[PDB]
C-alpha cells in the first residue's frame, strides 16, 4: 500500500560515474568497457560557451589534455572523439563494474531515473519524465553535466539521458548517449526557451488509477464521457490528445479496477473543470502527470531487479 | 537549480539485502558482517499473526529453519536470537559487501530513504520522514518487510529503520535495527491507531527557503511575527510549535536568502490563514514538511558521497 515517486536502484550505475577535466572545467563522465561518455562542452571555457566551434575548439585538444578520475585513480586515454554533443573518450581500461546496459532514445511522456553526481560523485537519486517540449524538471547544480537517467529492465541499464544545461525557466535539457538533444536545444549559452508544457493526461489516469487502488475513491462519480468529447476539455487546458493506444495501454489498469478509462476520464474532466476544492489525492493538491501506467503496475504488482 | 525528494544512492545497501524465508513466509533481511537482520513475525503463520507468543513460537525453531538466500546462493545459519522485534540470525559467511555502517535510533521530522525490497531483491529508491506520530507514509506492498530506511554520511551507511507492517490509514510502522517500535507500535494484526498527524513546521520553513533561492518568491510579503505570535497560528493547524533551536538550524538559509526566519514565518501564517488561492510552489499546491533544513542545504549545496 502507498504510493511514492521511487527511482530505480542506482547501485549498477554508481559504479559507472567518473570525473572529466579539461582545463578549469570538471563534470561527470559514464564508464561503460574501454569508453568514457561526457558533454563535449567541457572543452569550452566560461568564453567559449557564449558561441563554440566544437570542432575548431577540439583540434587544440590532445588525449594528454583529458584527466578523466575514477573514484581516486586517473585513467589514461588513448583515444578521443565527438559524436553529436556528446565526446567519447577511449581509455585503455574497461571498467570492471560494467553492467549489462543499451542506449535508448526515450519517447516524451516516458519515466526514468536520474544519479545526480558532482566530480563523478553520485549525490543522490530521483524520477523524471520526458515533457512533451523535451524539458525535465530536475534538479541539477553546477558541476552536475554528465549526470545521466536510466531505466533497469530485469537486469538490463538502459541510459537514455546525459544532463547537459539548464534553461531559463529554471527546467533542464540534454542529449541521449549519442548525443542527440531531445527537443530543439543546442549546446551554447543563448536565449533558447521551451514550447508549451503540455500535461501527459495518460499518465494522469494512471496515477488517477493509483489512487483508487489505494483507496482514495472521493473523485469518482456516476457520469462516462466519449473520447472525443473528453479530448475536447484537453485542448483546452493544454492536455496531450488521448488516444485508442492510450486507453488500451490502460487496460491492466482498468481490469483490476473494474473502472472502464471512459468513466475515470469523466472524474478527470470533472476535476479539470471544478477543481479539487482543497481536497488531495495521494496527498497531492494537482493532478500528477510523472507517473507512466507502467510505473503504477510495477508499483501496485511489485517487481524486483537481480 | 530545481528542487525534487532525491533518495541517497542505493548501491552501498543493495549489497547488504537478502531473503529470509520460515516455511510458506519470505521477507527480506539485512546482511552485515556475519549477521542478518529481519523482523522476527518470518516465524509466524497466517493464524499466529492475531496473537503471537513470539518467546514460545521461536522454541519450535532451530538454525536449520531459516532459508536465508543472497541473490542466488544459500547461506548457512549457525545462530539465531531475537533482539526486541528483530531476530538476528548468525550465518557463517561474513558479508564481503559489507559498508562502512551504523545504527541510529532517528528522531521524528528527520528523513531517510527507503530502499523496498521483495524476496530480497532491490524494487525501488525513495525518500521518507518519521513523522511526529512515529508512523511514514511509504510504498509497501506484501514482501516488503525487512526493507531498510538509511542515511548516508560521507561513506558511512546509517541504517534507521526496518519496514514491519501497514496500519489501517495505509501508513507504515517499523523498528530501529536494535528492534524497537518508533511509537507505540507492536507486531501484531490488532487494532492499532496512529495518533495525530502534526505538520513539520521546520521543514515546511526550509522548503520556503528552497522556494525562494529557486525564483518562486510571490508568497513573500511586508509583514514580520514574533515566535510565540506564529505558534498562536500553528497550535490551531497542527503545525509543531517553533523553537530557538529551529531559528538557529535556518540560520544557513536566513543568511544564504538574506530573509529573517520570523519574517519567513509571517509568509507561513499568511499561507495557513489564506491557503494557496490555485497558485504553486516549487510545483506543489500544499505545503511540503518533508524536507529538513539539512536536505535543503545538501540540494543547494551539492555535496557528494565516496
Redesign the interface.
Known amino acids: 500500500?502507498?504510493?511514492?515517486?521511487?527511482?530505480?536502484?542506482?547501485?549498477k550505475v554508481?559504479?559507472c560515474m567518473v570525473q572529466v577535466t579539461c582545463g578549469t572545467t570538471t563534470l561527470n563522465g559514464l564508464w561503460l568497457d574501454d569508453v568514457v561518455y561526457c558533454p563535449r562542452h567541457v572543452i569550452c571555457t566560461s568564453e567559449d560557451m557564449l558561441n563554440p566551434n566544437y570542432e575548431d575548439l577540439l583540434i587544440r585538444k590532445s588525449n594528454h589534455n583529458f584527466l578523466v578520475q575514477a573514484?581516486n585513480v586517473q585513467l589514461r586515454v588513448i583515444g578521443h572523439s565527438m559524436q553529436n554533443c556528446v565526446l567519447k573518450l577511449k581509455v585503455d581500461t574497461a571498467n570492471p563494474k560494467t553492467p549489462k546496459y543499451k542506449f535508448v532514445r526515450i519517447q516524451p511522456g516516458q519515466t526514468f531515473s536520474v544519479?545526480?553526481?558532482?566530480?563523478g560523485?553520485?549525490?543522490?537519486?530521483?524520477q523524471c519524465a520526458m515533457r512533451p517540449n523535451f524539458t525535465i524538471?530536475?534538479?541539477?547544480?553546477?558541476?552536475?553535466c554528465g549526470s545521466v537517467g536510466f531505466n533497469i529492465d530485469y537486469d538490463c541499464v538502459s541510459f537514455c539521458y546525459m544532463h547537459h544545461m539548464?534553461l531559463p525557466t529554471?527546467?533542464?535539457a540534454g542529449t541521449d548517449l549519442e548525443g542527440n538533444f531531445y527537443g530543439p536545444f543546442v549546446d551554447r549559452q543563448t536565449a533558447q526557451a521551451a514550447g508549451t508544457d503540455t500535461t501527459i493526461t495518460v499518465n494522469v489516469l494512471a496515477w488517477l488509477y493509483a489512487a483508487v487502488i489505494?483507496?482514495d475513491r472521493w473523485f469518482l462519480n456516476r457520469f462516462t464521457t466519449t473520447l472525443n468529447d473528453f479530448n475536447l476539455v484537453a485542448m483546452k487546458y493544454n492536455y496531450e490528445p488521448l488516444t485508442q493506444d492510450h486507453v488500451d495501454i490502460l487496460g491492466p489498469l482498468s481490469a483490476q479496477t473494474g473502472i472502464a478509462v471512459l468513466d475515470m476520464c469523466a472524474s478527470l474532466k470533472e476535476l479539470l473543470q471544478n477543481?479539487?476544492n482543497?481536497r488531495?489525492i495521494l496527498?497531492?493538491?494537482?493532478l500528477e502527470d510523472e507517473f507512466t501506467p507502467f510505473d503504477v503496475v510495477?508499483?501496485?504488482?511489485?517487481?524486483?531487479?537481480?
Open positions: 500500500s502507498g504510493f511514492r515517486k521511487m527511482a530505480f536502484p542506482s547501485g554508481e559504479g573514484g544519479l545526480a553526481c558532482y566530480n560523485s553520485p549525490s543522490g537519486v530521483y524538471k530536475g534538479s541539477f547544480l553546477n558541476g552536475s539548464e529554471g527546467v533542464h489505494n483507496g477543481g479539487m482543497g488531495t496527498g497531492s493538491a494537482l510495477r508499483q501496485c504488482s511489485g517487481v524486483t531487479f537481480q
